[PDB]
Amino acid sequence: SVLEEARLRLHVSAVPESLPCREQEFQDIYNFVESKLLDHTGGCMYISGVPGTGKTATVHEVIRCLQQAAQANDVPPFQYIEVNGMKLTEPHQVYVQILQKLTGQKATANHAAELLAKQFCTRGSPQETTVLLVDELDLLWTHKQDIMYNLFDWPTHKEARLVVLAIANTMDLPERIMMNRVSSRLGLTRMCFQPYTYSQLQQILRSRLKHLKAFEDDAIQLVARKVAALSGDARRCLDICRRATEICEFTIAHSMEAVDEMFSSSYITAIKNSSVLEQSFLRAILAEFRRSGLEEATFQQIYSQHVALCRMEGLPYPTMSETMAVCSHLGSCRLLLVEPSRNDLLLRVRLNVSQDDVLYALKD
């Protein structure tokens, strides 16, 4: 079906061959390592960007192009190694992960680091140029900063033949996280990937659905505009498109339902569907806060206000245990803040949501 085809094309893992939306950046990268591949000299580059900008996809596409060029005997052969920071149980273990990738040897972290140092500092046999990719750089931090120092200092050696690209989310990392000598080593080589403009998102969506007439232009434009006005991320845009297809299986209304169901908060409806006693408890808390003006109140005054409200409403007299049970149930779903494990009558209570939201939920 056409809807099935659209669902298949819009999947996240369905990477396109090449989209010129980042071609400029691509071209820049396509030069740098290329020069480093032609002069037989290593280098280092730091790329910082918000998630969802296609940094990993761009790097992988560049690596694919370089591999294809090498297969066509235009670039000297090279060894590619990729490591992910957050896929590692311990930081130092990365030394093993690199080593086993280049020699297959199993060794302890200290011994693996020593062997890597010996191989990258001593004039050994002429090896292929090494292209090292490290993902999630900020998660390799250490109080001693030895791993990061070695990673960004080893390509400085001529014998290393090492090219390193560090992908991260924070552009401040080389300044407030990285010390002085290593800061200048990555200095002047920072690539920043700006979020996609609504035109870029529209181009990406149109490229996803080429030769396929399933969505109207207004819905796609509104989805792209909303994404640009919210986060400017392609992943959530694809998710919204998929959910809109799902709803259409059941117009712009579909996209609106998707966006306001997958982004909006559910606190208001949870408060609305609460029980009567919970509503009385919330009203008592609000009344006590208005009387006092403080954002922290002991459980005793709240209980007194609740008793007064129950007397006003004519409800039966509530016991302390019932009120404490209701308080615990409310605190379980993170609507309030309390530590009732030991203290019972002297519990500080703080609202986890804005007061105006509570008012708008309780007016109805």
Binding site: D217, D218, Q221, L222, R225, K226, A228, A229
Partner: protein
């Protein structure tokens, strides 16, 4: 002039209430400004107090106390038609904008300019506008 005098006295007393260091503007301030206006009327030799005397009295009291685009208009016009509805008819908004003294070209320009800001989306048939 009584209504204007009452409005001015209200403004002055509101200002004196907002400021804690201002003198207590009780009935005596109104009596004083009335006396000032009557004195000015006597000075100008007129049997009826005019608004110029009241303005001069207000000026004197204030000095004494001091010693101590078409796009926006059209956007407001179409905002007036958001009384409980998300979508607005094109013809009604166009007629209301023209009745305000704006040519349809300026209406189209304002519509496009506020459409750039992701405020709303206009139907391809130019018959209804859905406010985002």
């Amino acid at each position: 002039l009584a209504d204007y005098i009452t409005a001015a006295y209200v403004e002055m007393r509101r200002e004196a209430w907002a400021s804690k260091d201002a003198t207590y503007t009780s009935a005596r301030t109104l009596l004083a400004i009335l006396r000032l206006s009557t004195a000015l009327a006597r000075l100008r030799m007129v049997d009826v107090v005019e608004k110029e005397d009241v303005n001069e009295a207000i000026r004197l009291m204030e000095m004494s106390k001091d010693s101590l685009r078409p796009a926006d208009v059209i956007f407001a016009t179409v905002r007036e038609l958001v009384s409980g509805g998300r979508s607005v008819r094109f013809s009604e908004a166009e007629q209301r904008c023209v009745s305000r003294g704006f040519t349809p070209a300026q209406f189209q320009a304002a519509l496009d300019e506020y459409e750039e800001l992701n405020v709303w989306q206009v139907n391809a048939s130019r018959t209804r506008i859905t406010f985002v």
